[PDB]
Symmetry: C3
Subunit: 118 residues, 3 copies
């Protein structure tokens, strides 16, 4: 599973390392992936590139997650709830977090030299 994290540079860079491990812990606890399978890409944005809603603050953060289809709604909902709860101490409140999950068949993936369904 691949993660992409977006946020203003000035507020995402100080917390980049701890946020990485916390997101990885949610991947392990809600979806049972081994901790060493961490796949994250961060995109710190300048203020002129980030047009977020005015109801939110400069700490507004977006996580996009691509993974196999076939997991239940309950597990995907558990992951969303873990992400909201565990980013709180980083200064990212529920209003300042947004998550989107995309699911594709395993035969659309390739890793370690074979299609995903193989």
């Amino acid at each position: 599973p691949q993660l992409k994290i977006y946020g203003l540079r000035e507020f995402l860079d100080p917390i980049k390392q701890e946020l990485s491990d916390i997101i990885n812990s949610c991947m392990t606890d809600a979806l049972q992936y081994p901790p060493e399978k961490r796949n994250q890409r961060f995109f710190p944005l300048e203020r002129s590139d980030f047009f977020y809603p005015p109801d939110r603050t400069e700490r507004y953060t977006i996580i996009e997650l691509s993974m196999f289809e076939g997991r239940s709604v309950a597990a995907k909902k558990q992951l969303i709830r873990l992400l909201f709860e565990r980013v709180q101490p980083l200064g990212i409140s529920a209003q300042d977090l947004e998550i989107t999950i995309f699911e594709t068949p395993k035969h659309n993936w390739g890793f370690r030299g074979l299609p995903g369904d193989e």
Copy 2:
């Protein structure tokens, strides 16, 4: 509804503020979203990082839209035509604009503390 706009930095940077309001008005018009929910991320690109078809110009621009499933094809097509019509004053002709819309279930989203279906 998240949008991501890609273009050459040389030509996207001078116009991204107007283009942002133009794009926001198409969301409001074709999809009835309030202007307050503007959610956009701009990605100005280097020339060596952007390989686009040779029959297009340096003003080539890509818009990626991610939203809930459930809107009609007619509403999505009205959005595509409004984007083509309205970015044209900014120097983006129809050859230089490409739009892709991705849709996912509501329970795949996390925003404001809860899975989207709640």
Copy 3:
């Protein structure tokens, strides 16, 4: 077909012109787009922004493909196998390449002034 390519800037920048033609050759070989329909975006990343698995090297490269629905699994699988085989000369091993393909209907696309299902 839109392609996004990610990797550390140290190793993506010197090879990306060669990587661009190699990827475009795999799209033409496996899915028969004309080579003039190349559509790629590269994102060279810094060290503090790329958290890849530790069983992988600094050469780890990610390729995302977004295209129309309708191509067969066999065609998509051949595209995956070709990408793995052809990125070898540029020093990217099988463990260091990951591919993801997203499909959407044609009416979800806009290009050349019209929705994709009207051309």
